[PDB]
Symmetry: C3
Subunit: 332 residues, 3 copies
């Protein structure tokens, strides 16, 4: 009887941060209540000032990471304010039935809905908007995020020993398909309906114009670089709702990686680069061993360094000359 279960309301946070949670379940199964408000907004996605009409969950690309435990119930109140122009919904890859909830959550502007589903499978999973006839447009406009369903006894390694993270970050990778004129400049549009056929044409090329982390070129750099300390165990959750990606920590590794994100499977060990298929979330665990700057990239290096799929970690602590040293510094 679900009415007899504890309810807990979660207040979500902006990626790449993640709301507070317990890795090992400190309660029995609960109904975990989330609220997200859809926001259609202009977003500047690159250094040139290219501005698109983004479709977001909770004002961000990606949408926030939701975190529950296996066999919790997820209850989501989805709000589509009358300041928006489009119909939206939500599909959870974690859920079973009704197109992941999409069939039950169609909200016109000025409407809201509440969906409840049982999180029966542990893993990281994509969620995204999926309105009938317009699915890839919404998804490639930013309307996706992820949900992590932790095993009730937390994460385990390939031998069944606990893996406990000290920090968790969520990197949502977004492929945008900004329509171009024949000279190659980005086109700009007066209404969503007037943009639609050109959006479809741009998507059909299958060639993204931008591939970004946390919604824009350089979003995870500078004052917004990810941080860690030598010796800290960090879990990076990475999602891509539409297109394959291949994350790589430049200077590091994925010590334990669930490339397709599902925690009943033993992790892959010692990965340099891992493939997260389009429509999947993955998770990588690493213990930092050296200080300094790391780049976290999609290792199609064109996608990383020309199209935007690169962020930074800044790591504090002691340098280990046993692991790496310059013997002879560059010289004539």
């Amino acid at each position: 009887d679900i009415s007899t279960l504890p309810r807990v309301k979660v207040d979500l946070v902006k990626p790449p941060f993640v709301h507070a949670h317990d890795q090992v379940a400190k309660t029995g199964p609960r109904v975990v209540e989330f609220t997200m408000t859809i926001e259609e907004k202009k977003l500047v996605i690159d250094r040139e000032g290219t501005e698109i009409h983004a479709m977001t969950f909770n004002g961000s690309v990606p949408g926030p990471l939701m975190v529950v435990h296996e066999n919790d119930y997820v209850e989501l109140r989805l709000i589509n304010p009358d300041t928006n122009t489009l119909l939206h919904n939500i599909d959870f890859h974690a859920a079973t039935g009704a197109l992941g909830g999409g069939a039950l959550t169609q909200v016109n502007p000025g409407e809201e809905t509440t969906l409840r589903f049982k999180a029966t499978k542990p893993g990281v999973f994509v969620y995204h908007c999926a309105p009938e006839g317009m699915v890839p447009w919404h998804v490639t406009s930013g309307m996706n995020g992820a949900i992590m369903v932790l095993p009730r006894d937390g994460l385990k390694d390939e031998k069944g020993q606990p893996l406990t993270y000290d920090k968790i970050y969520y990197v949502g990778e977004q492929d945008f398909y900004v329509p171009k004129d024949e000279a190659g400049n980005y086109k700009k549009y007066e209404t969503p309906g007037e943009a639609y056929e050109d959006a479809v044409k741009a998507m059909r090329t299958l060639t993204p114009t931008h591939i970004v982390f946390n919604g824009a070129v350089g979003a995870l750099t500078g004052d917004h670089a990810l941080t860690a300390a030598v010796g800290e165990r960090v879990l990076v959750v990475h999602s891509q709702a539409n297109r394959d990606t291949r994350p790589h920590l430049i200077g590091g590794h994925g010590d334990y990686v669930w490339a397709t994100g599902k925690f009943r499977n033993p992790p892959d060990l010692d990965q340099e680069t891992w493939l997260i298929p389009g429509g999947t979330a993955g998770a990588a665990f690493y213990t930092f061993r050296q200080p300094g700057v790391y780049a976290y990239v999609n290792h199609n290096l064109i996608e990383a360094f020309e199209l935007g799929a690169a962020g930074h970690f800044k790591v504090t602590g002691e340098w280990n000359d046993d692991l790496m040293t310059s013997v002879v510094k560059p010289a004539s």
Copy 2:
């Protein structure tokens, strides 16, 4: 001595259906006899009426699924009728030697050949035509299928317990590269030889114009939707002879997935989306838990919803409100 083994003749069926077979071998090793007739034919592949010259095994794209057990012999009689215009052959990824049989099966129109090979490795495997100098043209014109080699004691889960399916479907995913003029309209051709250089040019773009299941946009929808009942265990075999794909059951999961199709390996559990590399067949097992419509898609959603890589399951049975429910239906 192969002459002392039982022979069994199989009558193949059109995808997505699969010929009758036993999951657990009820006989010792056998010579399993198949016959396929090559058919070059016009096929309408989309809702616009785009018509291509398809090259098929047995009149279908994909070719039929063949099913044998490990250490059976597969004996194929391949017929190229004099009504065809091209040289064809067959390469089995399940076979060992002679380019998978391709070197031994070159049949001009009006010729036939019979190949026998030992199915030494259990899994789902691609087969395709591969004529010297013309390989990707034949494959991307539809001339591919798959063969399933079951373990003699049937499928097993990650712990070695039996997995028995109630139903099996074969989804062949086909990438077509229809030549376009500079305005972007599809070109139409008077002879294969006159089409060839433009086919090569179109392929070289590496951008398919269509990506379809069972040979056409919408082929697995409507009266031809896949079916199941709540509680039925379904195995979906999925092949792609040329290009990576990422299957996803919208509203469901891959409970047990062999993404690269080889049954000596433990399956991946609880998958949302799985990556089947180009030139591979994969297999996913799911037990339906909810009724209604499911979409089975390539989760590059542009490929699914704009280029054609989407089918439907219609599932009968009882709705489970514990797994999913609308708490508050969409309202103002």
Copy 3:
């Protein structure tokens, strides 16, 4: 104390060959000394005579395979002769810290540097040049290779039994993005600086013009085909520094495959095709069972047969008619 360890100097060889090494470590940990000299040179990459300005480690594309054991130290002297024009460096995916060494190895023409790192994780790993602001240009101009870090007790199968190879080959797969004019012909450039923006434009299309093994179309064919004998156990290491690939041995299999290259993980068994993500090296082990010609390809068959990603094995020995035979040779 690293000064108390044995030092061993390795003399590298040109791919696809690999320098001599022991699979099982016959000494304790060592400092393994390598030297590579950067060479910028013109390379003809296709049958049409398309000539690019390649950037190489040691004069080859790919760079040579380095082979050490887990917990050895790798000491590399990198030389950038004054006959080159560009700044280069080296990033090892096997290393920990300083962007894989890239931050410590920036060498202008006329400079050299020596880097030492501890090879703490067993596997095959990519190395590549990665100069700040120019990374994908150098990598896609050929400046990448791989390093194999063997477990001290050699390779093991999924049950922990030894796997010993008789022969090893290194196949580096290179994606080139040769700039094209609007008619589609390759453009040719007077200086690197004058080529740069067009190189960037070509890369941004995300569509390689050439995808080659060992630096050119047909490099691993004819007198340079890979060789083996029936019954020989062969390990093929395959890297791709920028783009996903899907190797396949036509007529064979990957008996044991580490698709993402890391030997602490059990191998995948009986693979037809495997996915090596961009920025990764993988390794496949096969025991030949049939003589003749095999094709080793990227199984996007357009990439293989139109863009160049195909090589040959020539295998000597006895034909096994039990595994495959022509029953009825092609006839009217």
